[PDB]
Design an enzyme around this catalytic site. Structure first.
Site: not given
Ligand SMILES: N=C1NC(=O)/C(=C\c2ccc(N)cc2)S1
Ligand SMILES: [Mn+2]
Ligand SMILES: [Mn+2]
Ligand SMILES: N=C1NC(=O)/C(=C\c2ccc(N)cc2)S1
Ligand SMILES: [Mn+2]
Ligand SMILES: [Mn+2]
Lengths: 331, 321
Positions: B11, B13, B55, B91, B177
């Site tokens: 996380d 962010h 995230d 994603h 997740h």
């Molecule tokens: N290597 C990565 N893994 C993620 O979950 C990533 C970004 C992401 C962005 C917004 C979301 N709601 C969930 C994951 S980047």
């Molecule tokens: Mn999430």
């Molecule tokens: Mn989060």
């Protein structure tokens, strides 16, 4: 066995596969009869990969537009690209000079992949990079990508020409600092082309062939769809596209190029023909009864795609695209 | 081997700008320092495996170039210390799956688990590790309208993971997740409707359950050890009382698992409460903010008529409720 590079003492030879302008994701003739070129394109690519493995090349050079879409490439096209990049890396280390890139996503990807891999290198600036070939050969790359940001504010023409020449001069100087082999890679249009060489446009970079650093062992170019041997010293080649994209590429010969370098001998190269589908344009004044006989007869056992060009309407045209699945354009 | 040192962080962010509707603050510099501290501690402890959940990017669908650059940069830094396993959060951009697959196939120092499909990886010292991934399922809204078989679908996946966790060599690690059922208190995403999973449904046979999506550190259970490491910075004032960082898990075959919390020491948050804003309130607020090395929220109850442009004169004050 091992899957890494070999290290042969005093090896003064380099086998190169050079291909370009794949245009992955292209669909031709969308305004008359859309034809997805993917299957044909993948066949050609397979043949190139097979020749690379067969000839056991030391280095693979990718120039030109590997994708067709300048800004919004489809997932299938992207998947195909990464798939074939991966296939080539298993054979030999790959050097990629991207063409007219619009989206910034490429530069971050290219840099990251380059940082974590020793079998692929993305050159996306004018900065020279040194790479190691399949058998341990040290190769200096002199990259010349499409200028970005500065190309938008290129005016005036005079200073832009001087900017380009300055970059080439710097590339020349750094080529003198080569350990073993030095290769130039460029994405632009050589001044004074005569063929196809026609499209464009686009905003193109015109460069005199005499400005390409003469002290390189090979000059690998991309951007134009037709195979051209620009010069012999230094050996400068556009490999061309792998398929005939439009009917201006009817008489073109399509494929890749195999190059062999020896530090004492002059460079030699053989063409690797992709043998893509042929194209043909049929010309008529009017589509009369004789023309109908001509068109139907030709397309009958013609293995490629056909375009018909005529001057004047002379009554209701028969559903020719219905009876002839080969015919893709009657303007 | 028979041991396994793990760095589990989540996380991040990256790309986040806090309090946009109030006083937008780019958290990049702070976040990078926290990230730098976590990386340094992974090098010191000489970990065998780095697990990334949650995230890592703040933006769901349109992450900035700067955020992507920082992500790839830090992935690269992680890879120099130990093999990396990434379970992506919710994603949205289809390019991620291809990128992840490509990167996974061209490098033996990083793995992206994009699906429910189990993956075997090797840690820094030869440790064979079986990853049981449970990502946010795509087309989750397609069967969400039913609710009934949607739960049955999720349960089936967990069962398969359990069955697949059984046939393992050395170590087996769960990566999920989702939001564990019963979690009250941040509880800050979406929300919205996330995936809710009962903690007992987490495959009890695994050696460790690495979870993400929750901003606050939570030891969910002990057998199997299930942990949300939480975020690296205090994203918003709900996390004011949180201690932020990562988790160092030291696994040993035979002996029970243990873990240490690695403090990232990000900037502090403070909320000041007043009944109303009078002249005496302004003085204490200004004096506290002037000496507070973090970000300040002020909430008050009674309408105090008109008050000075505090957010115009106090750069420290980022929100007034
Ligand atoms: N290597 C990565 N893994 C993620 O979950 C990533 C970004 C992401 C962005 C917004 C979301 N709601 C969930 C994951 S980047
Ligand atoms: Mn999430
Ligand atoms: Mn989060
Ligand atoms: N590795 C790559 N290099 C390119 O030039 C690529 C794509 C591309 C797409 C459309 C263009 N007009 C030019 C280049 S992809
Ligand atoms: Mn081009
Ligand atoms: Mn082209």
């Amino acid at each position: 066995i091992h899957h890494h590079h070999h290290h042969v003492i005093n090896l003064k030879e380099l086998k190169i596969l050079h291909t370009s302008d794949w245009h992955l994701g292209v669909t031709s003739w969308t305004s008359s009869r859309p034809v997805d070129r993917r299957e044909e394109l993948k066949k050609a690519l397979d043949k190139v990969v097979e020749e690379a493995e067969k000839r056991e090349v030391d280095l693979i050079l990718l120039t030109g537009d590997l994708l067709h879409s300048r800004n919004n490439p489809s997932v299938v096209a992207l998947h195909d690209l990464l798939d074939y990049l991966k296939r080539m890396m298993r054979t030999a280390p790959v050097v990629v000079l991207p063409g007219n890139h619009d989206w910034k996503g490429l530069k971050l990807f290219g840099n990251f992949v380059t940082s974590i891999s020793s079998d692929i290198t993305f050159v996306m600036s004018f900065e020279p990079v040194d790479v190691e070939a399949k058998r341990g050969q040290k190769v200096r790359i002199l990259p010349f990508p499409y200028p970005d940001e500065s190309e938008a504010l290129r005016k005036n023409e005079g200073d832009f020409r001087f900017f380009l020449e300055s970059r080439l001069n710097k590339l020349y100087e750094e080529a003198l600092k080569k350990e073993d082999f030095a290769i130039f890679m460029g994405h632009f249009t050589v001044e004074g082309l005569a063929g196809y060489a026609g499209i464009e446009q686009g905003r193109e970079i015109i460069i005199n062939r005499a400005l390409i650093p003469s002290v390189v062992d090979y000059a690998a170019l991309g951007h134009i769809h037709s195979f051209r041997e620009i010069q012999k010293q230094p050996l400068t080649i556009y490999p061309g596209s792998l398929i005939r994209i439009d009917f201006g590429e009817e008489a073109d010969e399509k494929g890749a190029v195999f190059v062999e370098l020896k530090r004492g001998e002059p460079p030699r190269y053989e063409r690797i023909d992709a043998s893509p589908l042929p194209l043909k344009t049929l010309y008529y004044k009017k589509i009369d009864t004789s023309a109908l006989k001509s068109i139907r007869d030709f397309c009958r056992n013609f293995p490629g795609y056909v375009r018909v060009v005529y001057e004047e309407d002379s009554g209701i045209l028969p559903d020719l695209m219905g009876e002839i699945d080969n015919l893709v354009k009657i303007e």
